[PDB]
Amino acid sequence: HMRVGYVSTNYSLGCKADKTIKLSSLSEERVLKVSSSNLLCLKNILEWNLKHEILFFRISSNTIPLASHPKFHVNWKDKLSHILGDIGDFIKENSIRISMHPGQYVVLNSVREEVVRSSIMELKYHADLLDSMGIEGKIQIHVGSSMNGKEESLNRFIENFRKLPSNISKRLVIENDDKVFSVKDCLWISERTGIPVIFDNLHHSILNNGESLNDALSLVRRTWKDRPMIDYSEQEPGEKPGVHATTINEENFRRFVNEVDEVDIMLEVKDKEISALKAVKVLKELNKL
Numbered sequence: 175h176m177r178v179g180y181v182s183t184n185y186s187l188g189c190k191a192d193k194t195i196k197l198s199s200l201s202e203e204r205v206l207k208v209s210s211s212n213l214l215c216l217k218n219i220l221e222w223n224l225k226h227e228i229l230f231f232r233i234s235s236n237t238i239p240l241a242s243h244p245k246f247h248v249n250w251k252d253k254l255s256h257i258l259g260d261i262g263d264f265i266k267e268n269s270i271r272i273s274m275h276p277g278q279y280v281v282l283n284s285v286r287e288e289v290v291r292s293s294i295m296e297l298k299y300h301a302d303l304l305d306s307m308g309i310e311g312k313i314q315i316h317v318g319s320s321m322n323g324k325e326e327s328l329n330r331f332i333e334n335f336r337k338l339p340s341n342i343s344k345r346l347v348i349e350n351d352d353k354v355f356s357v358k359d360c361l362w363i364s365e366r367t368g369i370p371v372i373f374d375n376l377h378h379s380i381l382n383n384g385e386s387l388n389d390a391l392s393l394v395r396r397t398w399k400d401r402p403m404i405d406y407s408e409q410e411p412g413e414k415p416g417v418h419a420t421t422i423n424e425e426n427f428r429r430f431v432n433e434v435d436e437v438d439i440m441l442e443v444k445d446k447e448i449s450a451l452k453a454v455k456v457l458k459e460l461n462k463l
């Protein structure tokens with residue numbers, strides 16, 4: 175009862191789904207050209223993934239390049255409605271679960287009004303992309319800044335969250351990080367907002383309040399109405415703490431899954447689909463796929 179995913183693009187297939195363009199290259203034609211090629215490759219990836227028993231995917235934020243930039247005014251929702259609807263049908267037809275992660279420049283709890291504004295613009299593009307596919311999906315973010323200290327920063331997150339439009343807020347999920355905001359801190363936010371928490375195992379291993387894997391999982395499960403998503407990674411040997419592994423280690427992964435069930439696992443390792451294949455092989459063997 176576990177789905178496996180990987181993030182953004184598939185290197186083996188050779189259809190790049192995560193291409194972006196420089197601000198200096200912005201034009202309607204170029205945005206439509208790179209969006210179309212990204213989306214073609216995304217459809218090809220989702221097809222490949224279904225055949226390889228990989229039923230979770232993290233769609234790249236580069237899918238429509240520069241979509242939330244102030245100078246961007248391309249009507250991609252109409253112009254690409256065809257391919258967008260087609261990809262969404264394939265996802266809903268085949269029970270594929272979807273997440274997106276806008277990354278570090280979304281800082282929903284910034285003290286700077288213009289940073290909050292641009293962060294909401296980026297979140298609105300993610301909700302628009304998912305809406306254009308006719309699917310639900312989750313948009314995962316970190317809590318953000320710790321300016322003025324942790325408690326002020328948690329309350330600024332909750333305040334600004336409560337100003338979001340529903341098509342973003344209904345999809346939003348928060349994840350623990352390895353520097354400031356722990357599982358405990360995310361659970362404090364969830365209790366006051368209903369936001370589900372994505373558990374990231376490597377981050378928790380680095381920054382925690384003593385909770386075991388199982389206890390932290392059980393806590394985070396209660397924040398979801400549906401099956402939880404978790405982010406699985408490992409430490410790259412020899413690197414600074416928190417640097418993500420270049421591939422999963424099968425024995426580490428086996429030790430993790432033997433503890434867990436009824437969760438969709440997103441692999442955040444640098445060899446992408448190659449690790450997703452190793453994980454499908456383990457899960458099938460353990461009758462947990």
Ligand SMILES: [Mn+2]
Pocket residue numbers: 349374405442
């Ligand atoms: Mn993560």
